Amino acid sequence: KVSEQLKCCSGILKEMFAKKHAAYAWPFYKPVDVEALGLHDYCDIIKHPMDMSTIKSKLEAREYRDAQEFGADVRLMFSNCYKYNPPDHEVVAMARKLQDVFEMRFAKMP
Ligand SMILES: Cc1nnc2n1-c1ccccc1C(c1ccccc1)=N[C@H]2NC(=O)OCc1ccccc1
Fold this sequence. Notes:
Site (Acetylated histone binding): 85
Largest sheet: none
Strand content: under 5%
Distance between the termini: 8 Å
Family: Belongs to the BET family.
Organism: Homo sapiens
Protein name: Bromodomain-containing protein 4
Oligomer: monomer
Bound molecules: ligand WSH
CATH class: Mainly Alpha
Domain Bromo: 1-109
Number of helices: 7
Shape: globular
Number of strands: 0
């Protein structure tokens, strides 16, 4: 069961990285580069930063003990985005589009 669900989770992340979703997924590929982006207050507001590459590394290092732990990291990524940015921000619109993809696949896990 657990190995099966983590297998599915790897398939979900792979979909999220796929060219099909690149136009709204790209901001989540890597850790937020606060210095490059000039986000002086990002670490004041966001205590547990998360991104798709860190999630990929954690999967491949077999650091998730079940699918819900993986699920909580993905949702943390998205929540950090919603916490930091105003609701009308361009990056929030992208986050919700990508969360469409995640939530639909995640719910249909065996
Ligand atoms: C993820 C995530 N969470 N927040 C943010 N990203 C993020 C992470 C990585 C990369 C981009 C972003 C974008 C973003 C994404 C898409 C469009 C616009 C902004 N916006 C970032 N937020 C912000 O205020 O950037 C200022 C800004 C605004 C405009 C330009 C430069 C800097």
